[PDB]
Design a protein around this nucleic acid. Structure first.
Ligand SMILES: Nc1nc2c(ncn2[C@H]2C[C@H](O)[C@@H](COP(=O)(O)OP(=O)(O)OP(=O)(O)O)O2)c(=O)[nH]1
Ligand SMILES: [Mg+2]
Length: 522
DNA sequence: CAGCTCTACGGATGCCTCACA
DNA sequence: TGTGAGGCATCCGTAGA
């Protein structure tokens, strides 16, 4: 239980660091915040020796923290950190460099005193063929900490101007809705009462069906009444205002005017990323909102987005010959499923058309039936398509891609309840859910590809001082000094394609890369 | 029985509790 | 003998991939 300070600093302790493998590093501090506190005790545990402790509040100057920094920066020595997302954050925040972080928490979450725990976790992950994903996550710990440290900078002037504008628009829409409803005594945010107000106004479907649910899907069916438009518009404006615009400035840390979110690695069932504080993942797609996120001055962003990542993992899982043949021809499946039922011709597909076709493709790939598909297409598109035509189209798609149909068959027959993705991320379902079963593998593989891409990205940008700032389920965006922007673009391409090659062998993945002044200008 | 899936988050609404003189 | 304030799980609805 040696305590290292100026009184008994002999410099011989550094000789212990020579030729070592494990070190159960765990730090202590005065609180939880990273920009407002400092490290009090750093504890390092070495096998066959008592835990050694360093206190930073009494040792000053340099030449004492030489062995510890050398061990930390070394890539050949593993650092066992309990919940290595807070301690590593503190270590990286200051002028300390840490590498080869191994977390027992991450390993534990991939299932069903640090020295013993490392073995008890490594042996159990090696017996389960989870070593690849565990290595990817442990090497991805550092990119997560880099994202948390950097955060993202906000264009406050545009944000506040837009907040005032949306406030005015919401005010006028509230006035219009209150005038139209002829009530002026009901909170428009109470669904249970506005639905009654709609009922007592003679609003019903053209098929003599009264309003029952106000969900936008059901709310569109009951159009042709000059009251549903007002409800939809207000609700959209009210969400755009309250949900994010009001709550965005309250999440900005002081003295840095940068949003420092919180990134979670295993709080999502499929292995994707959950941001439990201001959800930069949830920003509205429209560019006019994401234009408020900006680089630090004189720097620039690289943004990369996977090109139709899904339906490619599905293609390889299914061994569907026609799918892979089409992919080799560079034709979008989403655009095809658009043009088959929509405005004619392929090149006349816009972003909204591509999005609704994306919804249809994932629906019926994961199990959406032809009557629900009819409802979806009729609601979101002005087809007025009949049921028989929809059934014929459904059958045509399911027979055109024979591999897809055969896969659907086998998954329907089997009830193993155990599922996995291309990196052996095993899951035990509670009950056999058809669409959940079809959906787990593809999204899990997508998340694993994203994590490996991040790992390589951080391990490879070190030569040009590269920093990663955001990652939304398949898209990566990074900061690099403008002097090296083109190199950073090539860096991100190599960071993603190679990662894809580690999982998808048949179809060559592609990535859209862009040079961006904002998070919005994709 | 039969299917589109994962997540977070704001805001109404009965249930629970207690309290005193 | 009366509210009563508060919170506190439970849905509705839309946001994003
Ligand atoms: N199940 C499902 N997933 C959806 C839906 N809309 C979007 N996604 C998700 C699933 C994929 O992980 C994710 C891929 O990111 P994008 O939204 O950009 O789509 P994708 O890459 O397939 O197409 P892209 O080439 O980027 O236009 O989209 C939907 O309606 N259903
Ligand atoms: Mg994409």
């Amino acid at each position: 239980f040696f305590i290292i300070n100026d009184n008994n600093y002999n410099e011989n302790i550094n000789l212990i660091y020579k030729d070592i493998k494990y070190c159960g590093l765990n730090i202590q501090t005065t609180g939880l915040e990273v920009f407002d506190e400092n490290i009090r005790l750093i504890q390092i545990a070495v096998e066959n020796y008592p835990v050694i402790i360093y206190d930073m509040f009494n040792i000053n100057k340099k030449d004492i923290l030489d062995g510890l920094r050398k061990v930390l920066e070394n890539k050949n020595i593993i650092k066992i950190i309990q919940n290595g997302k807070f301690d590593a954050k503190f270590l990286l925040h200051n002028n300390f460099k840490i590498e080869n972080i191994f977390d027992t928490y991450i390993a534990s979450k991939l299932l069903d005193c640090l020295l013993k725990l490392y073995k008890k976790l490594k042996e159990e992950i090696k017996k389960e063929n989870l070593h690849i994903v565990n290595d990817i996550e442990n090497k991805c710990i550092l990119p997560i900490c880099d994202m948390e440290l950097n955060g993202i900078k906000v264009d406050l002037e545009n944000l506040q101007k837009s907040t005032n504008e949306i406030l005015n628009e919401l005010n006028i829409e509230k006035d219009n809705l209150k005038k139209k409803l002829k009530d002026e005594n009901i909170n428009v945010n109470s669904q249970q009462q506005v639905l009654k107000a709609l009922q007592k106004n003679n609003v019903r479907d053209i098929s003599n069906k009264l309003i029952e649910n106000t969900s936008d899907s059901n709310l569109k069916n009951f159009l042709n009444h000059e009251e549903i438009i007002s409800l939809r518009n207000y609700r959209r404006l009210y969400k755009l205002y309250s949900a994010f615009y009001l709550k965005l400035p309250l999440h900005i840390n002081t003295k840095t005017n940068k949003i420092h979110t919180t990134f979670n690695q295993l709080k999502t069932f499929s292995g994707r990323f959950s941001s439990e504080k201001p959800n930069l993942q949830q920003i509205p797609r429209q560019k006019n909102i994401r234009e408020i996120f900006i680089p630090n001055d004189n720097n620039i962003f690289i943004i990369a987005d996977f090109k139709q990542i899904e339906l490619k993992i599905a293609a390889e899982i299914t061994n569907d010959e026609i799918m892979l043949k089409a992919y080799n021809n560079n034709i979008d499946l989403h655009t095809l499923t658009a043009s088959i039922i929509t405005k004619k011709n392929i090149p006349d597909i816009n972003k909204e058309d591509r999005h609704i076709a994306k919804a249809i493709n994932f629906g019926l790939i994961y199990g959406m039936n032809y009557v629900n598909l009819k409802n979806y297409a009729n609601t979101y598109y002005g087809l007025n398509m009949s049921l028989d035509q929809c059934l014929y189209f459904y059958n045509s798609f399911f027979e055109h891609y024979k591999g897809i149909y055969k896969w659907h068959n086998q998954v329907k027959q089997k009830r193993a309840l155990q599922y996995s993705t291309l990196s052996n991320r095993k899951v035990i379902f509670p009950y056999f859910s058809f669409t959940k079963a079809l959906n787990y593998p593809v999204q899990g593989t997508c998340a694993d590809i994203l994590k490996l891409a991040l790992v390589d990205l951080y391990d490879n940008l070190k030569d040009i001082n590269g920093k990663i700032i955001l990652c939304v389920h398949d898209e990566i965006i990074i900061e690099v000094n403008k002097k090296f922007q083109e190199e950073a673009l090539k860096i991100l391409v190599q960071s993603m394609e190679n990662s894809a090659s580690y999982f998808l062998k048949k179809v060559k993945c592609e990535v859209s890369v862009k040079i961006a002044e904002n998070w919005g200008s994709k």
